[PDB]
Amino acid sequence: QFLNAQDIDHFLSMCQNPMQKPVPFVPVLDRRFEIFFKKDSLWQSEHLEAVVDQDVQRTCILHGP
């Protein structure tokens, strides 16, 4: 069974919980997309074990030209 309309609204509520490490994915394209996309962007370089293909090339690495 596909997700009940209410349980999608619940899913997206738990994704906006501030007592929770921001969730490592984009669950919807709406107004809140710039936040979902950018929120918690700096830890992944330190921990590639927990990124999709253990892949540097997804990640943000801050560095000076």
Partner: protein
């Protein structure tokens, strides 16, 4: 947001107070059975 808290569910249409599905029968069955079926003609439904 329900009074600050974030809420996703049913809510009494009049008081906007959160209602659980298990509590619908207790809260509303009686009222549903009184206002459904064959019953005394309700004037508000038929232009007084």
């Amino acid at each position: 947001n329900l009074k600050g808290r974030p809420y996703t569910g049913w809510v009494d249409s009049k008081t906007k107070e959160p209602v659980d599905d298990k509590d619908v029968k207790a809260k509303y069955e009686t009222s549903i059975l009184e206002h459904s079926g064959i019953r005394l003609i309700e004037p508000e439904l038929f232009n007084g």
